[PDB]
Amino acid sequence: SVPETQVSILDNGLRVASEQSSHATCTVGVWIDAGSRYETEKNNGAGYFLEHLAFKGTKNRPGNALEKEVESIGAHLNAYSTREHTAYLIKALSKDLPKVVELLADIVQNSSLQIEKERDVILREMQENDASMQNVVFDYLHATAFQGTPLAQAVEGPSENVRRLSRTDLTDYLNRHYKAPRMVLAAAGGVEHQQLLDLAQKHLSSVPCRFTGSEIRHRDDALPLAHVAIAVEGPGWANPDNVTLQVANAIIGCQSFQTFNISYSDTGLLGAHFVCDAMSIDDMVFFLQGQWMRLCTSATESEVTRGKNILRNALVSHLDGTTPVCEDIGRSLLTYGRRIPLAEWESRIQEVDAQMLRDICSKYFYDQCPAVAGYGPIEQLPDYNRIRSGMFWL
Amino acid sequence: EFGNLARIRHVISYSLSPFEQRAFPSYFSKGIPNVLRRTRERILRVAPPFVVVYLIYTWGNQEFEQSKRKNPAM
């Protein structure tokens, strides 16, 4: 009926989590509790840089050898880095676990650091990373909301550091933030937990953040569209009320008016990002603020239901596939320390009603000072007094 | 109206929430120096006309009084 997410631990402290499923392939990944939040402004691009260099060269395998092999096995090799977590995962035919795991072992330890080229790659892309307006907006919604903290700095880092980075520095980040107790080996799909535990024993057995209500406005009138993000302080990753906030986002769901609940270790950003022609930015903002307020004082069981149901169809599961699940296993072992099953999520969803939703929404959204990040033709975007006054009703 | 006022480019603008910042940051700390800075850049343009108004006013008064004062011989 339902998978078990059997998880164990090893000498090193590395955890080995798995969730067997009847699908045939598997997504075996390594998560690491290491991101841009653990960097100290002298190595602001070390994690990103490592990834670029990683997946390319190692101790048992020279240069393409790993890349060459994974292709040989037919597996897809992916890696990503956030402000708090780093993931290296392989999607591959289950039978290949033996090598899907040994390969991952090299990638986390015995890696060989090309550095010159990757620097160029990162730098040049960054020179163009400016094209991703949305990412820009979201990396300032971070800078202006977490001013003076390690949560303001981006994952990529400033070009400065990128140019000024050396093997030893990298080696440090690698030797400092790649500890075995901060690592999860997660497997999803057609894997046996005992075989994966034996492979982890054979290989890999060797291994005050503050929100500041503020505003950044990057005005550039030549852009055709404007992107605006407004957020308040998210509860956190472990905070129980996160779920009643997700239902609130499901109630909200001008243009491209998305909604986000980004969570970090006891902090986060809860808000909305919308892209609109300049002339309508103010009307959008007014619209949006009215809605948050609607939930705060005027929810409706019907709509809550609409929200609970959409949330119910978002929960990730074997159906979503191996990777989606692995990814959830790795994040759950890194953040909560355990894999929360879908039945517990359903219980926490069904205990949410309209009264506690408007209570939790009044707790967070109502009256707190927001962080605003605008990019584009944002002259008609209202300044901080009008947004702050729109954060409450008379 | 707003949105069609002007065209600027690449001018980033950071700001803080009112409740997050001190109401009177270093009010007398730098206020005094600044007010004094200001007064020195404008005092030579402003004050000497009013100084000679004061001299002309006094002069007029005294002249007037003196004028009225009787010449002993008169």
Cβ–Cβ of A214/B8 closer than 8 Å? no
Angle between helices A193-202 and A97-108 (to 10 degrees): 40
Distance, CA of A115 to chain centre: 26
Number of H helices, E strands in chain B: 1, 1
* CA distance to A137, A282, A308, A319, B7, per residue, from A312 (Å): 29, 33, 6, 14, 46
Length reported for chain A? 394
Sign of CA dihedral A49, A54, A56, A59: positive
Q: What are phi and psi of A343, to 5 degrees?
A: -70, -40
| CA–CA separation, A230 and A115 (whole Å) | 38
Place of tokens 């591959």: A92
Scanning the structure block, which residue is given the tokens 């978002």?
Answer: A314
CB contact under 8 A, B9 and A222: yes
Q: Are A93 and A112 in contact (CB under 8 A)?
A: no
Q: Residue B7 is which amino acid?
A: R
The nearest CA of chain B is from the CA of A157 a distance in Å of 18
Which stretch of DSSP H or E encloses residue B69? none
Residue B66 CB coordination number (10 Å)? 8
Exposed/middle/buried for residue A252 (C-beta within 10 Å: 0-12, 13-18, 19+): middle
Q: Inter-chain contact A219–B12, Cβ cutoff 8 Å? A: yes
Q: Which two tokens stand for residue A213?
A: 């209500």
What is the C-alpha to C-alpha distance for residues B16 and B46, in angstroms, rounded to an integer? 37
Distance of CA A5 to the CA centre of its chain: 21
How far apart CA A367 and CA A356 sit, in angstroms, is: 18
Experimental method: cryo-EM
Q: List A171's β-bridge partners, or say none.
A: none
Angle, vertex CA A84, rays to CA A81 and CA A88, nearest 5: 35
Give me the residue from B1, B13, B17 closest to A219, CB to CB. B13
> In sequence order, what are the residues at sequence separation of 6 or more whose Cβ sits closer than 8 angstroms to the Cβ of residue A45?
A122, A156, A157, A158, A161, A162, A165
Going A382 to A220 to A156 to A26, the CA torsion angle's sign is positive
The alpha carbon of residue B23 is apart from the nearest alpha carbon of chain A, in Å, by 15
Q: Measure in Å the smallest separation between the Cα of B24 and chain A Cα atoms.
A: 18
**Could you tell me the two tokens for A266?**
């006891």
What's the longest Cα–Cα distance across chain B?
85
Chain B interface disruption, residue of A144, A218, A285, most B CBs within 10 A = A218
Secondary structure, 3-state, A188-231: EECCCHHHHHHHHHHCCCCCCCCCCCEEEEEECCCCCCEEEEEE
Q: Are strands A371-376 and A214-219 parallel, antiparallel or unpaired?
A: parallel
Separation between Cα atoms, residue A91 and residue A97, nearest integer Å: 10
CA distance linking residue A324 with residue A316, whole number of Å:
7
A51 is catalytic: yes
Residue A92 CB neighbour total at 10 angstroms: 23
Would residue A131 be called left, alpha or beta, if left means φ above 0 and alpha means ψ between -120 and 50 degrees?
Answer: alpha
Closest CA to A360 of A209, A235, A265, A267: A235
CB A296 within 8 A of CB A263: no
Q: How far apart are CA A129 and CA A124, in angstroms?
A: 8
B17 close to A (CB below 8 A): yes
Q: Which amino acid would we find at residue A301?
A: E
Cβ atoms of residues A324 and A23 within 8 Å: no
d(CA A130, CA B12): 14
Alpha-carbon Rg for chain B, nearest whole angstrom, is 27
CA-derived radius of gyration, chain A = 22
> Is B5 in Cβ contact with A216 (below 8 Å)?
no
- Give start and end residues of each alpha helix (H) in chain A: 46-53, 65-73, 97-108, 115-129, 133-140, 159-163, 167-177, 193-202, 242-252, 281-297, 301-312, 322-335, 342-350, 354-364, 384-390
Distance CA A51, CA A184 (A): 17
Instruction: Tell me how far apart the alpha carbons of residues A94 and A196 are, in angstroms, rounded to a whole number.
Output: 11
Contact status of B21 with chain A (Cβ, < 8 Å): no
Contact with chain B for residue A313, Cβ under 8 A: no
By 3-state DSSP, what share of chain A in percent is helix, strand and coil, each rounded to 5? 45, 20, 35
Q: What is the resolution of this structure in A?
A: 3.8
Cβ contact (<8 Å) for A218 and B8?
A: no
Is the separation of the CB atoms in A278 and A378 below 8 Å?
yes
Within a 10 A sphere around the Cβ of A45, how many other Cβ atoms? Answer: 30
